[PDB]
Amino acid sequence: PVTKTRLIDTPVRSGQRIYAPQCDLIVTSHVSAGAELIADGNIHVYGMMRGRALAGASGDRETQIFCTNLMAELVSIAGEYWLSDQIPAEFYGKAARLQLVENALTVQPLN
Amino acid sequence: TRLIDTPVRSGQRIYAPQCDLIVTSHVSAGAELIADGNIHVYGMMRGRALAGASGDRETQIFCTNLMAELVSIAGEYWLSDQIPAEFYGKAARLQLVENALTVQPLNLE
């Protein structure tokens, strides 16, 4: 337990919940469907992201979500959230980078 | 306390500041319902309902045909898949027990 970033190089399986209190969260493996990722900082997912990522849970709007395989059910920064359908189909299964610009979700490729 | 007898098509946002929300028609996929009180949906509920938006933990959600994408009370949330299949597409009562989501049948046999 530290403010150090929470690194996890083991997949997060369906039904599990990972909470990084006041630090970034890093998942170097695959995130399953029922898997829920939440952190007050940033969220990095370096595998199949099939679950849920809630970044800036405490209200940090300058935080972002970085994925290599964006297949998420729900992706949230601060309070503003997107469901799988709101995610542009252009990115399903590719590398993506979600951040808040005005007061809304934005997605880029991070190439 | 708030009345909506017109379908809520995909993309709409419905606000209920400090009052219950009642939608007597259909809620579409992208439709987002939010309220600080209770939310009743008496039709095809296939969208999102966020109840107790201000933190009211005594609030509940009442549906007659529960097929929602996302349902949350006081921040605690469920997606369509987390809804027990027993109630998907049926009448359901979402409540907070202790500090977790619970679902019962609306009818109280």
Author numbering:
A (entry chain A): 16 to 126
B (entry chain B): 20 to 128
Which text from the study accompanies this structure?
In the Gram-negative bacterium E. coli, a tubulin like protein (FtsZ) polymerizes at mid-cell to form a ring structure (Z-ring) to ensure cell division, which is often spatially regulated by the Min system, including MinC, MinD and MinE, through a pole-to-pole oscillation. MinC, as an inhibitor of the Z-ring, is recruited to the membrane by MinD and prevents FtsZ polymerization. The C-terminal domain of MinC interacts with MinD, while its N-terminal domain directly inhibits FtsZ filamentation. In E. coli, MinC and MinD undergo a rapid pole-to-pole oscillation in response to MinE, which causes a periodic block of the polar division sites.
In this work, we determined the crystal structure of the dimeric C-terminal domain of MinC from E. coli (EcMinCCTD). The crystal structure of EcMinCCTD was solved at 3.0 Å resolution using the molecular replacement method. EcMinCCTD forms a dimer within the asymmetric unit via domain swapping. EcMinCCTD forms a dimer between the two β-sheets in each subunit, as observed in the TmMinCCTD structure. The tight dimer formed through the MinCCTD beta helical domain is similar to that of TmMinCCTD (left). The two MinCCTD structures superimposed with a root-mean-square deviation (RMSD) of 1.4 Å for the 110 Cα atoms (residues 122–231). Compared to AaMinCCTD, EcMinCCTD and TmMinCCTD both lack a helix3 at its C-terminus. SDS-PAGE analysis of the harvested crystals showed that these crystals resulted from a degradation fragment of the MinC protein at a molecular weight of ~13 kD. Furthermore, western blotting results demonstrated that this fragment of MinC had the C-terminal 6 × His tag (data not shown), which suggested that our crystals were from EcMinC’s C-terminal domain (MinCCTD). This is likely caused by degradation of the flexible linker between the N- and C-terminal domains of MinC, which is easily susceptible to non-specific proteolysis. As a result, we went back to the initial method of using full-length MinC to obtain MinCCTD crystals. It is inferred that MinCNTD, although cleaved off over time, initially helps to promote the correct folding and solubility of MinCCTD. In this EcMinCD model structure, the RSGQ motif of MinC and MinD’s helix 7 make up an interaction interface as expected.
